[PDB]
Amino acid sequence: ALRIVFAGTPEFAAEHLKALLDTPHRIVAVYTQPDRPAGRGQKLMPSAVKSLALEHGLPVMQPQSLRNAEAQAELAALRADLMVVVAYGLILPQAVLDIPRLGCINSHASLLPRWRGAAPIQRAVEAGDAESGVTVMQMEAGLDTGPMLLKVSTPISAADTGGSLHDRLAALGPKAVIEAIAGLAAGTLHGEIQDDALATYAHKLNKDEARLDWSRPAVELERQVRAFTPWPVCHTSLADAPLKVLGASLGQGSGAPGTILEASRDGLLVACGEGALRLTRLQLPGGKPLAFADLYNSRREQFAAGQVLG
């Protein structure tokens, strides 16, 4: 058994810490992001990892950066054998990788070298990958470039969303990390070098990206809708009125991109750059998520065929 420091912020990360608590290792400290300011007022919100640490009596460290000598000294004094890093917002410089005896390992939500970076769950679904998973990697100075210690995969079905894949990777990752730690303490686990030629980058979601580009092929939009469920949710406009798109499936049709080809109980068929997309679940501003069928008997004429979205 080892002295471990855990560093992570969101619910995906907390599931890993929760699993380490039922192991024989000593969690000597829990690093997480400083509490973020809420949208209004002065309250500061605790991260998922922070809340779990408090509930288990663990010491909490919330430095703003690991690139100063004070935080590096405080970490070095913990006399850690290993650092487990899971969706931690902060950059670990070389000096911190050098502090624990076994370095720092990360639980990354993709099958590396695919989807290095910020948003591996959404992009993997968005890109039409057939499978994804979790990679336990030995952290290096580069961005998600380090050697791969252990991988576990899961397929991506035509029905999977970002959230459904998140829930599965949140189950595999914690078990995967515990197993890699055991091999690391036994000295029997060694990392596989990444092929840089096959590496892809899962860039963070930007401002305009969740707005639907109807000139794209319908296949792509159908994946985007799923990938952004439940966050950030795709949207488009109709008569300069916003409209969130929460459910869609492939349909059959051709026309100028964005044109309503048909409106029925089964959904709203919109022409794309290639093919058509049947929208089945929508949300209007200041309203509830509704099947289009519940909107069809109440918004019949508003979605009359021939209008164009955007």
XYZ file of C-alpha atoms in Angstrom:
310
model
C 0.000 0.000 0.000
C 0.983 3.523 -0.961
C 0.676 7.120 0.146
C -1.463 8.600 -2.624
C -2.410 12.172 -3.468
C -5.635 12.471 -5.474
C -6.230 15.516 -7.660
C -9.489 16.073 -9.511
C -12.534 18.268 -9.691
C -15.829 16.967 -11.248
C -18.178 14.017 -10.684
C -16.198 11.883 -13.125
C -13.172 12.450 -10.879
C -15.057 11.843 -7.641
C -16.033 8.358 -8.778
C -12.338 7.532 -8.894
C -11.651 8.866 -5.393
C -14.738 7.049 -4.104
C -13.248 3.777 -5.390
C -9.775 4.423 -3.905
C -11.416 4.809 -0.479
C -12.375 1.100 -0.559
C -8.715 0.181 -1.168
C -5.839 -0.376 1.295
C -3.943 2.787 0.190
C -3.693 5.915 2.367
C -5.197 9.014 0.711
C -2.925 11.544 2.389
C -4.384 14.606 0.648
C -7.040 15.559 -1.896
C -6.216 18.312 -4.402
C -9.004 20.064 -6.269
C -9.815 23.369 -7.950
C -10.494 26.455 -5.827
C -14.191 26.893 -5.255
C -15.720 28.748 -8.248
C -17.885 31.844 -7.869
C -21.554 31.335 -8.595
C -23.332 33.355 -11.271
C -24.772 35.823 -8.757
C -23.900 36.912 -5.248
C -20.810 35.862 -3.324
C -21.283 32.138 -2.727
C -18.366 29.906 -3.707
C -19.387 26.425 -4.882
C -17.464 23.302 -3.813
C -16.427 20.835 -6.499
C -17.673 17.278 -6.558
C -14.267 16.001 -5.440
C -14.146 18.531 -2.616
C -17.563 17.538 -1.291
C -16.661 13.839 -1.225
C -13.340 14.553 0.496
C -14.996 16.546 3.268
C -17.602 13.835 3.884
C -14.737 11.332 4.350
C -12.543 13.535 6.566
C -9.830 13.899 4.067
C -7.507 16.916 3.993
C -8.286 19.253 1.112
C -5.733 21.234 -0.876
C -7.009 23.952 -3.217
C -4.009 25.814 -4.659
C -4.605 28.024 -7.690
C -1.425 26.849 -9.441
C 1.183 24.144 -8.987
C 3.854 26.263 -10.690
C 5.017 28.061 -7.512
C 7.579 26.813 -4.986
C 5.193 27.109 -2.004
C 2.637 24.696 -3.442
C 5.375 22.417 -4.737
C 6.978 22.395 -1.295
C 3.640 21.651 0.404
C 3.088 18.743 -2.001
C 6.606 17.384 -1.550
C 6.143 17.374 2.237
C 3.267 14.915 1.869
C 5.854 12.219 1.100
C 3.633 10.642 -1.537
C 4.394 7.481 -3.444
C 1.987 8.340 -6.262
C -0.282 11.084 -7.604
C -3.607 10.101 -9.208
C -4.877 12.895 -11.437
C -8.406 12.765 -12.823
C -10.006 15.704 -14.644
C -7.976 18.178 -12.589
C -8.161 21.638 -14.053
C -4.486 22.534 -13.418
C -1.291 22.031 -15.394
C 1.286 19.748 -13.709
C 4.735 21.155 -14.573
C 7.785 18.925 -14.789
C 8.803 19.717 -11.197
C 5.553 18.236 -9.869
C 5.811 15.082 -12.009
C 9.215 14.706 -10.350
C 7.921 14.904 -6.778
C 6.174 11.562 -6.049
C 8.351 8.460 -6.206
C 6.236 6.908 -8.985
C 5.362 10.165 -10.691
C 1.798 11.117 -11.547
C -0.821 9.022 -13.331
C -3.986 10.175 -15.049
C -7.354 8.567 -15.823
C -8.164 9.853 -19.318
C -11.618 9.349 -20.813
C -10.577 8.042 -24.216
C -8.557 5.314 -25.924
C -5.332 7.222 -26.313
C -3.600 8.316 -28.476
C -7.048 9.221 -29.717
C -8.696 12.312 -28.164
C -5.928 13.851 -26.181
C -7.225 17.007 -24.535
C -10.252 18.693 -23.091
C -13.501 17.084 -24.312
C -12.836 13.435 -25.198
C -16.355 12.233 -24.372
C -18.243 14.621 -26.677
C -15.772 14.479 -29.560
C -15.528 10.678 -29.643
C -19.294 10.396 -30.084
C -19.287 13.344 -32.493
C -16.587 11.844 -34.744
C -18.384 8.555 -35.254
C -15.843 6.412 -33.410
C -17.047 2.839 -32.988
C -15.624 2.484 -29.484
C -14.132 4.594 -26.690
C -12.928 3.990 -23.155
C -10.464 4.989 -20.454
C -6.654 5.123 -20.581
C -4.531 5.135 -17.432
C -1.486 7.063 -18.528
C 1.794 7.994 -16.914
C 1.789 11.777 -17.169
C 4.518 13.520 -19.165
C 5.207 17.199 -19.807
C 3.308 17.212 -23.103
C -0.488 17.343 -23.295
C -1.842 13.803 -22.792
C 1.265 12.383 -24.533
C 2.485 10.124 -21.755
C 2.930 6.345 -21.886
C -0.179 4.184 -21.678
C -0.277 1.830 -18.663
C -3.737 0.245 -19.055
C -6.764 0.667 -21.363
C -10.353 -0.539 -21.135
C -12.823 -0.082 -24.006
C -16.609 0.182 -24.502
C -18.516 0.421 -27.818
C -20.471 3.469 -28.963
C -23.936 2.548 -30.212
C -26.184 4.506 -32.530
C -28.175 5.410 -29.416
C -25.315 6.617 -27.193
C -25.167 10.256 -26.054
C -22.354 12.111 -24.348
C -24.062 11.430 -21.045
C -24.607 7.729 -21.611
C -20.920 7.323 -22.504
C -19.915 9.479 -19.530
C -21.865 7.164 -17.169
C -20.089 4.120 -18.596
C -16.612 5.641 -18.469
C -17.336 6.735 -14.900
C -17.789 3.044 -14.078
C -14.756 1.679 -15.937
C -12.204 4.353 -15.010
C -12.248 3.869 -11.249
C -11.762 0.106 -11.564
C -9.095 0.661 -14.220
C -7.077 3.007 -11.991
C -7.115 0.646 -8.973
C -5.758 -2.140 -11.158
C -2.971 -0.003 -12.610
C -1.973 1.166 -9.123
C -1.619 -2.463 -8.047
C 0.673 -3.239 -10.955
C 2.639 -0.055 -10.247
C 3.163 -0.987 -6.570
C 4.125 -4.540 -7.575
C 6.561 -3.150 -10.175
C 5.079 -5.305 -12.952
C 3.223 -2.701 -15.050
C 5.012 -0.759 -17.780
C 3.604 1.813 -20.179
C 3.116 1.464 -23.945
C 4.624 4.270 -26.041
C 2.066 6.352 -27.942
C 2.125 6.511 -31.724
C 2.117 10.247 -32.398
C 0.937 9.678 -35.987
C -2.422 8.301 -34.816
C -3.106 10.871 -32.111
C -6.123 13.120 -32.331
C -7.130 16.124 -30.260
C -10.528 16.607 -28.583
C -10.633 20.401 -28.437
C -12.841 22.131 -25.864
C -16.319 23.203 -27.010
C -16.447 26.793 -28.207
C -19.082 29.509 -28.278
C -20.760 28.970 -31.644
C -20.247 25.228 -32.042
C -23.505 23.981 -30.526
C -25.519 26.010 -33.075
C -26.655 23.717 -35.872
C -25.136 24.185 -39.331
C -27.852 22.789 -41.584
C -25.536 22.586 -44.635
C -23.666 19.712 -42.973
C -24.541 16.095 -43.821
C -27.484 14.843 -41.767
C -25.354 12.031 -40.331
C -23.028 14.576 -38.762
C -25.833 16.624 -37.214
C -27.476 13.468 -35.857
C -24.226 12.618 -34.043
C -23.754 16.174 -32.834
C -27.201 16.202 -31.203
C -26.340 13.003 -29.315
C -22.789 14.059 -28.433
C -24.084 17.294 -26.862
C -26.720 15.549 -24.819
C -27.116 16.442 -21.982
C -24.596 19.278 -22.321
C -24.280 21.692 -24.053
C -27.398 20.801 -26.120
C -27.661 21.771 -29.781
C -29.833 24.712 -30.810
C -31.116 26.471 -33.934
C -33.607 29.206 -34.723
C -37.027 29.524 -36.318
C -38.340 33.025 -37.115
C -35.477 34.503 -35.053
C -36.829 32.478 -32.081
C -34.413 30.150 -30.251
C -35.004 26.433 -30.158
C -32.989 23.699 -28.410
C -32.740 20.339 -30.192
C -32.734 17.467 -27.701
C -33.513 14.434 -29.865
C -33.049 13.563 -33.509
C -32.756 10.579 -35.814
C -31.906 10.046 -39.453
C -34.750 10.565 -41.906
C -35.129 10.540 -45.686
C -35.392 13.651 -47.858
C -33.599 16.243 -49.955
C -33.882 20.022 -50.140
C -32.220 23.339 -49.433
C -30.482 23.094 -46.042
C -32.771 23.863 -43.124
C -36.077 23.528 -44.965
C -38.931 21.865 -43.106
C -39.874 19.043 -45.476
C -42.641 17.614 -43.322
C -44.175 18.023 -39.894
C -45.949 15.014 -38.431
C -46.709 13.257 -35.167
C -43.465 11.301 -35.652
C -41.339 14.445 -35.845
C -39.989 17.446 -37.764
C -38.122 16.451 -40.959
C -35.538 19.071 -41.997
C -33.471 19.011 -45.172
C -29.695 19.021 -44.732
C -26.617 19.328 -46.949
C -27.004 15.590 -47.541
C -30.130 13.722 -46.532
C -32.623 14.859 -43.891
C -32.892 14.928 -40.107
C -36.092 14.171 -38.175
C -36.198 16.203 -34.964
C -38.065 14.301 -32.252
C -37.352 16.227 -29.014
C -37.235 20.018 -28.640
C -37.322 22.753 -25.971
C -38.565 26.331 -26.543
C -37.345 29.312 -24.464
C -38.822 29.201 -20.979
C -40.438 25.822 -21.625
C -40.137 22.054 -20.840
C -38.468 19.326 -22.930
C -41.199 17.922 -25.161
C -41.568 15.229 -27.768
C -42.347 16.863 -31.082
C -45.670 14.971 -31.004
C -46.734 17.030 -27.946
C -45.656 20.128 -29.896
C -47.362 18.974 -33.129
C -50.920 19.190 -31.776
C -50.146 22.629 -30.210
C -47.650 24.281 -32.629
C -49.084 22.754 -35.854
C -48.984 25.853 -38.039
C -45.780 27.323 -36.545
C -43.742 24.464 -38.037
C -45.474 24.515 -41.406
C -43.523 22.955 -44.246
C -41.410 25.282 -46.347
C -40.041 27.395 -43.529
C -36.260 27.407 -43.050
C -34.433 27.091 -39.740
C -31.531 29.450 -39.053
